[PDB]
């Protein structure tokens, strides 16, 4: 099964399947190797993002009840942000 | 059921899901999948209690109401070699600024 | 002709039961004969109830406070059938899997009052597509061309 | 006369929403009007001098009716009510309340001791005029009922409901005598006896009045050329000149038939809205017509 490293600005290295990477377009790119730096997102953020693409791919196309996924406001913002660069 | 993972050790943190029916073994075996390092020489632990390779995740404490994929459970990697073991260290997360006073 | 999404006046009864399957307070939106948006009574989250409808009507469901689309047996759109065995029909309304960007506006959004948008230090883009708040109507372009 | 040649003479917009019903009184001195704007008003059935304001109803009103002697006056509210009124002083005698929804149509018995109401509750209800209680509460319909009239003697009741069902009451026992089955069950829109009290006159909702003899259980005419598929459209005998049949349409247009032939004999231009109720004066060729929210207006025709 294909990981990939996601590294964070303050250098945090975080290890997710293709598959749930794939979830934005922005780094389908970055990768289209095996490793994507992020001059601009920091590990607290970059951690929040894996959490929501292991989130999407469980839940999409699921018979199941869907919970909420959760964003304290001190970080609102940032991930805002970071959704909007990755398109996901 | 499902649980849902941070396996963390220094800067490294690995995303990765498996049953509670699974053996803390099974985790490894994981982990020697991604790290190319074998299960004899790594050491698990739920915050500092090292976890015993028979038992279950579900064992531990590791349900699916506390390892959903939105916020799942933390699990600490030391490493060990022969006679030498690594310490558990896993290095905190970035901080948010202040809240901007419009909230 | 007449518009695409409305209820068609079969006149034959439908009982179903709306099972709110969902953390927010649900809205009953039900498409009249003309295709206009007529609203229901709400559901607070958990609770269902046994209500009466007709086959072929149309219906869709959105967060009361903040008319966030919702989803219902995992389409947007729900249309009663003909009761079978004196069972009512099923309508499991559900979150749907929100892109990580439309639930942080969503969380923005509530956390944040319109006047002070612009006060926030983010892009330019941010502020109209924030303000773009969700709507029955700026969405139902989408589904007429699915049906 | 072999067509009649009604001409517009006066045009009433004394209502501030749509007009409901209109209904001449029995002796052909006024018209009464029923509107949306929780208003019933009065005026003189030749000049349209408008007479008094009566007030009470608490939303919308639907229809109204005459007592036979015509100093007495019901009205189907929206307000789930029914209300008798003393027409000379305009002060509410009773309040009529039984009904779980919206009162639609309602009308006198001919000897003007009973009330018989229609209701989206799907009932159909008949009251004590002298006391204002609920006599009895027939379980008509699957659907709202659209219609209720009184034949000639009292004897019988005929209603119509959304299910698409016409039914004979006998008066006395509430029993259902006759139902009247169509091909499909188009929503029948309204119903009356003839004037003889042999023939009743349905309005289905596929754009089509019909002329039936219950008895017979035998359709004898067929009208049709005006659109009808939405409101639920008064139809009328036109007999103090020719046999006409009168209906208001959709195209906002006032539509007359040769109640024999059935071919149109006159279409009456002047409602900016769909035109809902109709009447024809007891006495005098006069046509009284009322049009819904973009109209707001009563219009009174004249002919030889």
Redesign the interface.
């Given at each position: 099964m294909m990981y990939v490293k996601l590294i964070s600005s303050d250098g945090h290295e975080f290890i997710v399947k293709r598959e749930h990477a794939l979830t934005s377009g922005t780094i389908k790119a970055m990768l289209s190797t095996n490793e994507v730096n992020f001059r601009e997102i920091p590990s607290h953020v970059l951690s929040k993002v894996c959490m929501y693409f292991t989130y999407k791919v469980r839940y999409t196309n699921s018979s199941t009840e869907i919970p909420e996924f959760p964003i304290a406001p001190e970080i609102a913002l940032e991930l805002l942000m970071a959704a909007n660069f990755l398109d996901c | 059921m499902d649980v849902f993972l941070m396996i963390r050790r220094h800067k490294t943190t690995i995303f990765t899901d498996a049953k509670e029916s699974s053996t803390v073994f099974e985790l490894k075996r994981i982990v020697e999948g991604i790290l190319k390092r074998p299960p004899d020489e790594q050491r698990l632990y739920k915050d500092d209690q090292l976890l015993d390779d028979g038992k279950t995740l579900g064992e531990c404490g590791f349900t699916s109401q506390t390892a959903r994929p939105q916020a799942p459970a933390t699990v600490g990697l030391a490493f060990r070699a022969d006679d030498t073991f690594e310490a558990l260290c896993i290095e905190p997360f970035s901080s948010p600024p202040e809240l901007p006073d419009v909230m | 002709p007449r518009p695409v999404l409305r209820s068609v006046n079969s006149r034959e009864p439908s009982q179903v039961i709306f099972c709110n399957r969902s953390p927010r307070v649900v809205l009953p939106v039900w498409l009249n004969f003309d295709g206009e948006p007529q609203p229901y009574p709400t559901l607070p989250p958990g609770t269902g109830r046994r209500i009466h409808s007709y086959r072929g009507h149309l219906w869709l469901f959105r967060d009361a406070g903040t008319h966030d689309g919702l989803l219902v047996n995992q389409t947007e759109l729900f249309v009663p059938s003909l009761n079978v065995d004196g069972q009512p029909i099923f309508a499991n309304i559900t979150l749907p899997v929100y892109t990580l960007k439309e639930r942080c506006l969503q969380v923005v959004r509530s956390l944040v009052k319109p006047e002070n948008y612009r006060r926030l230090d983010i892009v330019r883009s941010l502020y109209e597509d924030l303000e773009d708040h969700p709507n029955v109507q700026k969405d139902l372009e989408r589904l007429t061309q699915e049906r | 006369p072999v067509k009649p040649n009604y001409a517009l003479k006066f045009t009433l917009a004394g209502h501030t929403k749509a007009v409901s019903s209109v209904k001449f009184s029995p002796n052909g001195e006024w018209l009464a009007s029923s509107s949306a704007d929780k208003l019933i008003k009065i005026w003189g059935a030749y000049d349209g001098k408008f007479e008094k304001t009566i007030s009470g109803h608490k939303l919308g009103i639907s229809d109204v009716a005459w007592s036979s002697d015509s100093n007495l006056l019901v009205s189907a509210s929206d307000d789930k009510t029914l209300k008798i009124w003393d027409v000379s002083s305009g002060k509410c005698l009773k309040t009529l309340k039984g009904h779980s929804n919206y009162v639609f149509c309602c009308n006198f018995n001919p000897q003007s001791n009973l009330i018989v109401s229609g209701s989206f509750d799907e009932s159909v209800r008949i009251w004590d005029v002298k006391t204002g209680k609920c006599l009895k509460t027939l379980p008509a319909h699957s659907?709202p009922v659209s219609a209720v009239h009184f034949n000639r003697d009292g004897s019988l009741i005929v209603s119509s409901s959304?299910?698409g069902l016409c039914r004979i009451w006998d008066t006395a026992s509430g029993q259902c005598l006759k139902t009247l089955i169509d091909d499909d069950?188009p929503?029948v829109s309204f119903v009356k006896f003839s004037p003889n009290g042999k023939y009743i006159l349905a309005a289905t909702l596929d754009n089509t009045l019909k002329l039936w003899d219950y008895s017979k259980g035998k359709c004898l005419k067929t009208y049709t050329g005006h659109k009808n598929e939405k409101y639920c459209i008064f139809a009328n005998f036109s007999v103090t000149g020719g046999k006409w049949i009168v209906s208001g349409s959709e195209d906002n247009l006032v539509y007359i038939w040769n109640l024999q032939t059935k071919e149109i004999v006159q279409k009456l231009q002047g409602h900016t809205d769909v035109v809902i109720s109709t009447a024809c004066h007891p006495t005098e060729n006069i046509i009284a017509s009322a049009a819904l929210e973009n109209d707001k207006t009563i219009k009174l025709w004249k002919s030889d």
């Open positions: - | - | - | 659907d959304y299910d069950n929503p």
